[PDB]
């Protein structure tokens, strides 16, 4: 149920693990919905329904 756009799709270049509640656990070759992109860490959502921060270094602009 997609009401409208707000971010984009970004692929994970590398894997990571959520060491705190402010962050998330993601793997390379996965794609995530960004929500905020104005700083060093972007607010995205996993396909399982979980929101938090991940480093922009492992994120890349996916063409869809």
């Amino acid at each position: 149920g997609s009401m409208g756009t707000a971010g984009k799709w970004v692929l994970c270049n590398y894997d990571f693990q959520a060491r705190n509640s402010s962050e998330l656990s993601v793997k390379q070759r996965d794609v995530l919905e960004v929500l905020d992109d104005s700083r060093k860490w972007w607010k995205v959502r996993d396909p399982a329904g979980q929101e938090g921060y991940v480093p922009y270094n492992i994120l890349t602009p996916y063409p869809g």
Binding site: S22, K40, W41, G52, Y53, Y56, N57, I58
Partner: peptide
């Protein structure tokens, strides 16, 4: 070199 400078307004 992943994990850049610490982000503002955390979830904790």
């Amino acid at each position: 070199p992943p994990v850049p400078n610490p982000d503002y307004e955390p979830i904790r």
